[PDB]
Amino acid sequence: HWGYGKHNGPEHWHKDFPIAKGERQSPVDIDTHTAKYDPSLKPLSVSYDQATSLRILNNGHSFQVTFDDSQDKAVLKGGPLDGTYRLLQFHFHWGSLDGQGSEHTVDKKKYAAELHLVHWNTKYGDVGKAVQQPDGLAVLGIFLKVGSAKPGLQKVVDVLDSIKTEGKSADFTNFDPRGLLPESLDYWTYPGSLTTPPLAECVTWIVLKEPISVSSEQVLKFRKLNFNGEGEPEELMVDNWRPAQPLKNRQIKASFK
Template sequence: MHQCSLFILILLCVSVRDISGSWEEWWTYDGISGPGFWGLINPQWSMCNKGRRQSPVNIEPDKLLFDPWLRDIQFDKHKVSGVLQNTGQSLVFRVEKDSKHQVNISGGPLSYRYQFEEIYFHYGMEDNRGSEHQIDHHTFPGEIQLYGFNKELYHNMSEAQHKSQGIVGISLMVQVGEPTNTDFRLITSAFNKVTYRGSSFPIKHLPLSSLLPNTQQYLTYEGSTTHPGCWETAVWIIFNKPIYISKQEMYALRQLMQGSQLTPKAPLGNNARPVQPLHHRTVRTNINFNKQGLQGSNNCPDMYRNMHYTANLAVALADDIITDSSLNITTVTTDKEVTTSLPEIN
């Protein structure tokens, strides 16, 4: 009996050692290696289970804090080249390390310049799911996340992701519709080149700034990376307009597989981490809701009293995620109209 137990223990230790050599390949979005177990798979990922500033989150419009000091987001106009890769968990674009012209991200809520590094694609196998962040509990068909690292304080993404103010995450919600951005086709046309895990395809001269929606309205909060190890070092910026992808492009994206050509396993889609508790964090916005000439508070001059929003829940495909005129939540699919007041600030 003791010999049997010792044998099982040895096998377990060998298995754990083998897995620990490939943590980045072992985690998934479902099952015993899914999001609920990320913090248990690898002790260095403990924040995935224990952290209190985790991402993604659900954005509650009635709890947004208007901040008039938030600036416009600035992206360098340089084009970038890199590699689009199917990692088995996500579709990821990573910029060339030795590129002469790097794209810097600054402004907005950022106190430093951040150097663009990679793009993650999150999407669902159906249109009613896919994005990681939610707006008033509404989920978009997809979400594209641009990551950059703090180049003023740190040397690279590997170092910055563990450090304070190390990372910026730019979130672009994805809707299915008629594309308005031809530059995005540099990526979408390559979807069929990366069908299986480990496959990659070079992308040349991608104008990153032109991929962004035509707006300077955004929401921002302090959070984490949405993949292991869930490091709580990210400043998130969620633009207030989606970008569009055609039905054909979304179909091609949904053909990507988690496994190799010999063992394709399951589709790559539905690769979204569930929303995490906000834990009293503040979500700020530069959207000015004060359209009715309401008086500001003397004690809090950057907020307004008695502001209201109207959730116009019947229109599902309007451009704005949250409109600045009546704060219409145009992406929720119910036919009821809801009016809620923001809390008064004393």
């Protein structure tokens, strides 16, 4: 089974998931000087006021907070998107040290972590159908740097001890994902893929230019999670990021000059 170790990590994924070597794989390096400002790009519409969080879960590769997506409650629209995308879950990728952990990079710079808010296109009815479509998903990616604490992240960090190992979940109701957003919604966008198996090429990527700052104590608690299940040899959940993939025949567009 795939993971992030020496013998099952990203360099191995193509054997079970040959699309790993495909034409629109993610993440990528964002070369800021080559990204083209596109004046036709609309502002992002992030409508999270009625979000209903449900559970927080250690899924063996990250931890995720899952939302009620049976209704248009927390939706992404505008920007490069046509139609309405429902928020299903968010999760993070992070490093063993602050100098790595993000999946996307900016002029080769790695951030300490990266937040992914995963949304699916309501015209396909459910996320399983959406992942089979080139415009099925929209992922809002947000970089994390280490500095001041993010108060809106603390409720997440404080419950992680209850989902330390693979397969553990806990109630995580009444969490407001608006507390994870930076001030600016300036973004880069490009067509890409899921960054874990099945690596489906179904994602419109929307990567925010402005990172959020989190404290060293907050990211240190990420790094205490376990890849392993309870009772198994403890392998810290760190460096659960896929490296940048070839851009190939794609252009990254910027919403901002």
